[PDB]
């Protein structure tokens, strides 16, 4: 311990400012697109409880921005031109057509990813058999849901596969992936 | 000490048998080396610029002479001329390194501390060493001198018990660690084992060994070697190719490491100097006074090395400057006479260090050759296997 005065039984890890705004409220963790305007869960709540929609909009757009999304750097004064083209130099009708196309594409991609996740579930349920050598044939639903929401780093997947292959033990899961912080260099980016 | 009360005859026959001149008697327990700092005249601590500039200029002149010659006859000279210029350059640099070791312990020019820090850094860089880490390892050595299992920054001996453990784990005497120890402490390459020391500095390049308040100071210390090996070792190669590297840098480097290793190894190792564990009779003053050996060289060598062999005086008076080390020794030899050990650098000494004193066994508390020891403990392996019958 370094602590001269006070030291709880778990060491204090210095948490820092968040560097990115949270996912909105309307989004899901997966690849399938959101909902154009209103989410679906809004229909199963009290009218005097659905104020969190507009509050979340206010928070992401105006009042809770982490001072790291307001750094003036040389990369951002060029991204400004890209974005200003998209928002002021392109007519909203072409933007609307592109929006529809991109939605359709994302639905196809999400369908593909779901197919792949189910395939992975069979594969690892098969690998646990080699691992235990004997009976074990199940898989972990926790890991399936964590794979669908992109909550695993590749190293965690590899170590889980190895643990399965060697000792069965289908219920021992890697911890969880932490979100990536915004990269900053200097006046540069 | 190992040879306790016994007449002068056996002492002197042991002395001329091992190559020492005066063996040592026995010091009382319960003391400290810093005591005998009161036996020193106060004039020994005075600063004078004459000896300072002489000590920084003589080895520089030897180095410059060696380099001027070597470049005047770059690669047209036979191997013996190359060897001699390399030996001269290595010795000159060992002198400048003794000066840097003095600046690391803050006793060369105390009035200008920034200047002495910069000077020590500069003189230590060409050997690829760090000044703050050197200070730390040397202090840790002074605090634990001859302590078994703790003096890791000195010539810790290879004990019998750990060797037996490694032989039980290896399942025979043919493993990799086995042959490694076999060639490192049975061949003359032992006189260069200091290079191992060099690699154990850079404590993994790991800032997690130190106190946080010092990070910036430690990092800076590591950046002076690297900068050298990043800005100067290229130039040399680029300007002389492999040969122009092996003759201008690598041979003086090997000579300097010879000097370092032989000095330390002779300093704190001898058959009559025991290595007590902690709690089991380890005494500080007894180990710093009785457990030290003073090497005597020709006076030209001494003046070239900046009296680098005189180590006992600056362990009882850590502020005693470098040019007062010979004189001070003469004082202590009068009062601590019967207890000191002394030796002269001769071929017999190094042959004994290489061929005879290889393994340290604590039951007999002495050094014994590697081969007879391993075959003895292997015969006892056979006998415990016979004892393992049932």
């Amino acid at each position: 311990t370094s602590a001269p005065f006070i030291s709880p039984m778990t060491p204090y890890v210095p948490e820092e400012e968040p560097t990115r705004t949270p996912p909105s409220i309307k989004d899901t963790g997966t690849l399938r697109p959101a909902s154009e305007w209103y989410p679906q869960w809004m229909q199963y709540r009290r009218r005097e409880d659905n104020y969190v929609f507009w509050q979340d909009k206010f928070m992401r757009c105006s009042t809770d921005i982490p001072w790291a999304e307001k750094r003036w750097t040389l990369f951002s004064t060029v991204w400004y031109l890209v974005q200003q083209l998209r928002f002021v130099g392109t007519p909203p009708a072409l933007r609307y057509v592109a929006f529809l196309g991109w939605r359709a594409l994302m639905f196809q991609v999400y369908a593909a990813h779901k197919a792949l996740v189910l395939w992975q579930c069979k594969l690892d349920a098969g690998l646990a058999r080699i691992g235990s050598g004997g009976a074990t044939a199940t898989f972990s639903k926790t890991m399936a849901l964590r794979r669908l929401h992109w909550r695993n780093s590749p190293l965690a997947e590899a170590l889980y596969a190895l643990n399965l292959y060697k000792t069965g033990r289908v219920h021992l899961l890697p911890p969880v992936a932490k979100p990536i912080p915004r990269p900053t260099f200097f006046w540069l980016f | 000490t190992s040879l306790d009360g016994l007449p002068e005859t056996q002492k002197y026959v042991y002395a001329d048998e091992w190559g020492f001149s005066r063996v040592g008697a026995d010091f009382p327990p319960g003391s400290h080396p810093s005591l005998f700092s009161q036996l020193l005249p106060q004039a020994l601590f005075a600063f004078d610029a004459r000896a300072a500039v002489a000590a920084v200029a003589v080895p520089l002149a030897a180095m410059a002479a060696g380099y001027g010659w070597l470049w005047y006859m770059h690669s047209i000279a036979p191997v013996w001329q190359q060897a001699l210029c390399a030996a001269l350059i290595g010795t000159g640099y060992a002198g400048l390194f003794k000066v840097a070791h003095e600046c690391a312990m803050m006793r060369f020019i105390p009035q200008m501390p920034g200047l002495q820090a910069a000077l020590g850094t500069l003189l230590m860089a060409p050997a690829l060493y760090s000044l703050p880490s050197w200070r730390l390892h040397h202090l840790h050595h002074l605090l634990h001198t001859n302590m078994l299992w703790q003096d890791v920054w000195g010539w810790h001996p290879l004990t019998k018990v750990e060797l037996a453990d490694e032989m039980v784990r290896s399942g025979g005497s043919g493993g990799a660690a086995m042959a490694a120890a076999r060639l490192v402490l049975t061949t003359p390459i032992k006189l260069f084992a200091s290079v191992g020391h060099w690699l154990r500095s850079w404590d993994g390049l790991d800032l997690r060994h130190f106190h946080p308040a010092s990070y910036v100071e430690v990092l800076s210390g590591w950046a002076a070697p690297l900068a050298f090996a990043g800005l100067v070792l290229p130039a040399v190669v680029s300007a002389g190719g492999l040969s122009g590297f092996v003759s201008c840098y690598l041979a003086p480097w090997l000579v300097f490491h010879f000097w370092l290793s032989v000095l330390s190894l002779t300093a704190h190792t001898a058959p009559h100097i025991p290595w007590r564990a902690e709690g089991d009779g380890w005494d500080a003053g007894r180990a710093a006074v009785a457990g030290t050996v003073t090497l005597r060289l020709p006076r030209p060598l001494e003046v070239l090395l900046n009296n680098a062999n005189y180590m006992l005086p600056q362990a009882v008076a850590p502020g005693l400057p470098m040019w007062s080390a010979p004189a001070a020794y003469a004082v202590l030899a009068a009062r601590l006479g019967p207890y000191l050990t002394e030796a002269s650098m001769s071929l017999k000494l190094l042959t004994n260090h290489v061929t005879r004193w290889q393994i340290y066994d604590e039951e007999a508390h002495t050094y014994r050759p590697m081969e007879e020891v391993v075959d003895e403990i292997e015969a006892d392996l056979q006998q415990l296997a016979a004892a393992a019958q049932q």
């Binding site: 899901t28 679906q40 869960w41 199963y44 709540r45 409880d49 199940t138 898989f139 639903k141 849901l145 | -």
Partner: protein, 85 residues
């Protein structure tokens, strides 16, 4: 913070019936999944269909122990309830 558990239950049962292929009267609030014909690889696809219909994300640790329709309904309701905060 206050969820109409009745609506959530009706919608859960309708989704389950449409996924499995059995009719809505057979899906009872206490019916386990193993008897409705569900085999592991499909107690997962049912979870995915549920999330896709309700647009929420399931808490995985509790989702490992879903075996009756009422637990599905209660998981979904506890997720919808904790949405603002």
């Amino acid at each position: 913070a206050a969820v109409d558990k009745a609506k959530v239950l009706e919608d859960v049962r309708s989704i389950i019936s449409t996924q499995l292929g059995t009719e809505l009267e057979k899906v009872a609030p206490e019916a386990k999944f193993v008897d409705l014909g569900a085999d592991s690889l499909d107690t997962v696809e049912i979870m995915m269909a549920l999330e896709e219909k309700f647009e929420i994300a399931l808490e995985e640790e509790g989702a490992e122990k879903i075996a009756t329709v009422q637990d599905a309904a209660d998981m979904i309701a506890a997720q919808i309830a904790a949405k603002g905060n």
